[PDB]
Amino acid sequence: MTLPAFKAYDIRGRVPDELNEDLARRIGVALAAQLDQGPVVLGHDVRLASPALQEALSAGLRASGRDVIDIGLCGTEEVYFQTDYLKAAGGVMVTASHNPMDYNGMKLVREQARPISSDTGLFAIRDTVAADTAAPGEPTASEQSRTDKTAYLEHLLSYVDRSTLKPLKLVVNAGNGGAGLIVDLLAPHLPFEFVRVFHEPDGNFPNGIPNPLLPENRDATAKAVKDNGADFGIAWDGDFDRCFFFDHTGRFIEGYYLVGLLAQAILAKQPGGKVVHDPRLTWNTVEQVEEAGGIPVLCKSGHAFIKEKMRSENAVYGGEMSAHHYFREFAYADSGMIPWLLIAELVSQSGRSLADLVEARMQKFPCSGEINFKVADAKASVARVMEHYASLSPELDYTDGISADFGQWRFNLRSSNTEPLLRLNVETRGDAALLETRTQEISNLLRG
Numbered sequence: 361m362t363l364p365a366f367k368a369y370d371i372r373g374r375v376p377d378e379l380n381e382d383l384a385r386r387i388g389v390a391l392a393a394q395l396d397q398g399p400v401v402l403g404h405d406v407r408l409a410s411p412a413l414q415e416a417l418s419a420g421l422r423a424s425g426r427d428v429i430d431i432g433l434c435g436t437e438e439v440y441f442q443t444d445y446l447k448a449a450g451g452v453m454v455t456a457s458h459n460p461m462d463y464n465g466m467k468l469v470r471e472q473a474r475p476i477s478s479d480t481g482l483f484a485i486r487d488t489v490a491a492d493t494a495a496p497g498e499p500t501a502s503e504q505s506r507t508d509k510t511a512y513l514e515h516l517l518s519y520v521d522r523s524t525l526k527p528l529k530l531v532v533n534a535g536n537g538g539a540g541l542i543v544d545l546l547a548p549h550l551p552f553e554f555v556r557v558f559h560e561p562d563g564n565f566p567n568g569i570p571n572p573l574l575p576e577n578r579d580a581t582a583k584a585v586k587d588n589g590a591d592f593g594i595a596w597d598g599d600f601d602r603c604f605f606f607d608h609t610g611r612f613i614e615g616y617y618l619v620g621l622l623a624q625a626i627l628a629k630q631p632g633g634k635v636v637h638d639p640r641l642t643w644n645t646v647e648q649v650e651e652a653g654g655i656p657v658l659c660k661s662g663h664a665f666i667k668e669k670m671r672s673e674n675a676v677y678g679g680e681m682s683a684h685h686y687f688r689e690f691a692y693a694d695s696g697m698i699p700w701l702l703i704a705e706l707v708s709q710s711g712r713s714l715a716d717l718v719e720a721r722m723q724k725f726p727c728s729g730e731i732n733f734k735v736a737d738a739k740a741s742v743a744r745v746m747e748h749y750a751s752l753s754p755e756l757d758y759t760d761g762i763s764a765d766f767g768q769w770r771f772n773l774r775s776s777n778t779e780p781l782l783r784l785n786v787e788t789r790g791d792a793a794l795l796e797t798r799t800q801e802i803s804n805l806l807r808g
């Protein structure tokens with residue numbers, strides 16, 4: 361047995377048996393040993409248990425001679441921004457994301473908010489913690505509280521020309537996570553008319569744990585949009601590093617289409633830039649990026665792959681279909697705030713609704729949505745799919761699972777690196793009927 365809470369990208373488990381204040385304190389001790397010189401930024405989400413896990417992190421860190429910058433209740437992206445902006449040695453965000461009520465977790469970064477993942481420190485942290493039986497030392501460094509968000513808010517606003525913004529009517533749905541705080545601090549500097557839904561942070565989640573992808577949660581933002589004649593609606597996950605868009609009809613916009621949209625928005629800022637994208641769904645992104653004068657860069661999905669690739673390529677923007685958007689100027693980190701500011705600016709400047717901006721693209725490259733299969737034998741199931749399609753001679757690429765291009769349609773089939781699952785994505789060249797028959801044909805094969 362190894363500590364179950366240590367995953368590929370972060371730490372998450374049930375408190376107290378998979379994650380607790382003792383483990384959190386040991387993690388702080390262990391993280392001090394893994395970072396270069398400098399202070400460590402700490403932050404936490406709205407969960408009731410999160411501050412105590414932060415305080416243990418801080419105690420272990422300061423017992424190890426690390427100055428601690430407590431930035432308080434915040435979104436994950438604030439930890440990334442402050443870690444990089446303040447030139448810290450690293451940062452930890454205590455966040456349970458959309459795990460159950462009795463779960464919590466941490467996301468860890470080193471200098472310039474570079475991810476710490478299982479193969480880049482996180483398992484080395486785990487191994488140290490698992491063998492650490494030492495007595496907790498006492499503090500030999502200080503903790504300072506740094507709640508000023510001015511630098512962060514100014515950074516967010518710098519992505520748009522505020523004189524070109526229109527008084528759009530925007531539904532905002534923090535899901536009782538933490539996004540409402542940042543919306544409200546931005547609001548005085550924006551002309552938008554906000555319709556606030558599930559706005560107050562409440563770690564008891566009276567309206568459900570924040571997760572806009574679940575249909576009942578999706579419909580609350582949809583309803584608010586349609587009922588209020590909003591221009592569009594934005595919903596966030598709890599630590600708001602993910603945002604989700606609803607057009608003026610209340611229709612949720614599948615994340616695939618936000619990648620090409622945001623890339624076109626950004627490439628009008630940065631001519632000729634590179635855009636990193638994942639291989640699950642591609643054709644639209646590639647065409648929208650080239651059409652906007654940029655260069656698309658294919659990259660294995662997963663935030664740490666995306667971020668490393670953006671760095672090596674100097675890519676201005678990176679987008680994943682699963683509602684993750686990374687920005688070079690934002691320390692190559694993801695933000696749940698930059699994207700909607702960019703979209704609001706695009707609608708304001710173009711005179712086009714969010715619906716119109718994506719409508720033709722969704723018709724031209726219709727996609728299945730990511731479809732998950734839990735199966736008895738992932739390898740055997742994947743082979744059953746590949747054998748069935750072999751006689752059609754698809755063009756195959758193994759960048760991230762299997763990508764098979766048949767000409768008028770393609771799919772990607774992946775093993776998740778964060779769950780024991782197979783994940784299917786299918787798209788076609790403007791053919792809804794071929795999309796359905798091929799999705800069902802593949803689905804039946806995987807379920808075989």
Ligand SMILES: O=P(O)(O)O[C@H]1O[C@H](CO)[C@@H](O)[C@H](O)[C@@H]1O
Pocket residue numbers: 369661662663664680682684775776777778779783
């Ligand atoms: O499909 P996987 O392996 O479970 O990866 C998912 O989690 C990553 C990190 O959040 C994301 O970066 C991925 O894009 C995806 O959301």
Ligand SMILES: [Mg+2]
Pocket residue numbers: 436457597598599600601602
């Ligand atoms: Mg999140």
